[PDB]
């Protein structure tokens, strides 16, 4: 019943070419979890724990939560971890999906493992995203930093384009978080 019920740990090492043996896909820049591509059997240097399977969602690297980050950030975390690499993953299916916007829509019970992971994934997405809003600029705010200040029409285009990972209203104004860029 729980989103995190099938989370497992796979301990791997770098293959003889220094790589992981699988490509990382998704990332917040596609509105997605980081998740694994095709796991070629024999390209992963397994160490302990459980095996990796294709298209599982990558949650943590050496106990650093990475879901909600770009692929840039995820690989940057990987690069600063010495072997062995402890990966926490979950297979997609049922309630578990790589789509970040839909995962942020889910209503979990406050205090649940599911809820705590959702807030962790929000903070990560917030690290490199600047929110957008239709309210007017207030004194002291830096456009492009505290907010992107856009009109209602522009906010509706971003929403209709699927650019927003999260949307809401407060005192008759629009707030949202756009997908981060690849830079």
């Amino acid at each position: 019943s729980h989103w995190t019920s099938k989370v497992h740990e796979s301990v791997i090492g770098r293959n003889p070419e220094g790589q992981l043996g699988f490509e990382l896909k998704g990332g917040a820049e596609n509105g997605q979890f980081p998740y694994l591509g095709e796991v070629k059997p024999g390209k992963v240097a397994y160490e302990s724990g459980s095996k990796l399977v294709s298209e599982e969602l990558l949650l943590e690297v050496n106990e650093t939560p990475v879901a909600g980050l770009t692929i840039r950030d995820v690989l940057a975390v990987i690069k600063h971890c010495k072997d062995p690499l402890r990966l926490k993953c979950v297979k997609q299916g049922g309630i578990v999906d790589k789509d970040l916007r839909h995962y942020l829509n889910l209503r979990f019970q406050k205090g649940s493992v599911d809820h705590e992971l959702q807030q962790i994934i929000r903070d990560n997405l917030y690290l490199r995203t600047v929110p957008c809003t239709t309210r007017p600029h207030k004194e002291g705010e830096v456009p492009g930093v505290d907010y992107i200040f856009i009109t209602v029409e522009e906010f509706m285009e971003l929403e209709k384009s699927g650019a927003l990972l999260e949307s809401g209203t407060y005192e008759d104004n629009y707030y949202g978080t756009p997908k981060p860029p690849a830079e």
Partner: peptide, 11 residues
């Protein structure tokens, strides 16, 4: 960076 109270309410 971190979101204000207003943004957090809007969600």
């Amino acid at each position: 960076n971190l979101r204000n109270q207003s943004y957090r309410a809007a969600m």
